[PDB]
């Protein structure tokens, strides 16, 4: 019963196609609640979950001011980074940043996060002590020096221990009926014959929240990790998630195989066989 808030900043340049676009989205656990897009007609930080809508004008104005400013800062940053790698004016490049806090069941800060990537590659990350940086290369050492002089680490600690957890706690209470409700998955096993030799047993999990889940197949009580096929957990569009695990069994041996389902919304962990 622990929770997290994360913010995801994406800045993409597109030379010849206007100034770099800046996108920000806010998540509580696996629930998006705000977005900002500098490409929109009227750029504003916008609600994306009902429980944030009740917030008032000073809220939305602060979140829009900071995001509009970041739109400019992140453009300066994309330019600086192009410099640090001696990159041409012509290529497209991506700066990404994700940050936020983790709190336990009592609301106490478990740890903070701030990580940056450039063109998909780890660039700079705030260390778990919330007061020092890990730079991935000599380009990021420059950013480290700038942030050292700007005392950014202090600012992150104050935010990560302060507003982040306080507002997370405020969000968790205002959306308690969804953010603090775990919906267990609905499950079933299917059977798709392949040849006369073998068939596929597919274990399904549907409608669960949050997305964290464990689907495993056993043959005679022994886990089958090399032999199991897992889809990536996928969103259903209605806040819930879907997943499935498949295993190819010798035909006739289907009952030596069990599927086990671990999920927070489940009273007790599930064991399912194929029921023909």
């Amino acid at each position: 019963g622990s929770h997290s808030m994360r913010y995801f900043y994406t800045a993409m340049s597109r030379p010849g196609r206007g100034e770099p676009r800046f996108i920000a989205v806010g998540y509580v656990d696996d629930t998006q609640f705000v977005r900002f897009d500098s490409d929109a007609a009227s750029p504003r930080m916008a609600p994306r979950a009902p429980w944030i809508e009740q917030e008032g004008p000073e809220y939305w104005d602060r979140e829009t001011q900071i995001s509009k400013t970041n739109t400019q800062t992140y453009r300066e940053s994309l330019r600086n980074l192009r410099g640090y790698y001696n990159q041409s004016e012509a290529g497209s490049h991506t700066l990404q940043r994700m940050y936020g806090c983790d709190v336990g069941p009592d609301g106490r800060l478990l740890r903070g996060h701030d990580q940056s990537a450039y063109d998909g590659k780890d660039y700079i990350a705030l260390n778990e002590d919330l007061s020092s940086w890990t730079a991935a290369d000599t380009a990021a050492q420059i950013t480290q020096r700038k942030w050292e002089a700007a005392r950014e680490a202090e600012q992150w600690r104050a935010y990560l221990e302060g507003l982040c957890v306080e507002w997370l706690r405020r969000y968790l209470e205002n959306g308690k009926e969804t953010l603090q409700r775990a919906d267990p998955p609905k499950t079933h096993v299917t059977h798709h014959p392949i040849s006369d030799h073998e068939a596929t047993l597919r274990c399904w999990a549907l409608g669960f929240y949050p997305a964290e889940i464990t689907l495993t197949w056993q043959r005679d009580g022994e886990d089958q990790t090399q032999d199991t096929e897992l889809v990536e957990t996928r969103p259903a569009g209605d806040r819930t998630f879907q997943k499935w695990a498949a295993v190819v069994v010798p035909s006739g041996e289907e009952q030596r195989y069990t599927c086990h389902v671990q999920h927070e919304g489940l009273p007790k962990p599930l064991t399912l066989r194929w029921e023909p």
Partner: protein
């Protein structure tokens, strides 16, 4: 500058039975950079209205998006998803596996 090609899954919000309102989903994930072309197709023709989720990304920095539209399956209707991205020589089509 390394690029990652999209994973693609096509599927319905709820289990599908012909004649009932439902949602067709095309979930594209694991890609980088973020520019992506995605269309939902009904026997080959681009469904006009399609929404999609706000852009976000995973722990490994790869991006993901859900493309969805309300629909009503029938037996003879075929659906698919067409995905173009820089890592892709030619657009990838992925059929909706009504079995799955």
């Amino acid at each position: 500058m390394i690029q990652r090609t999209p994973k693609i899954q096509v599927y319905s919000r709820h289990p599908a039975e012909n004649g009932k309102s439902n949602f067709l989903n095309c979930y594209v994930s694991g890609f980088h950079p973020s520019d992506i072309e995605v269309d939902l197709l009904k026997n080959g023709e681009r469904i006009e209205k399609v929404e999609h989720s706000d852009l976000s990304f995973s722990k490994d920095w790869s991006f993901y998006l859900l493309y969805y539209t309300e629909f009503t399956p029938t037996e003879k209707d075929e659906y698919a998803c067409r995905v173009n991205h820089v890592t892709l020589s030619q657009p990838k089509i992925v059929k909706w596996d009504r079995d799955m």
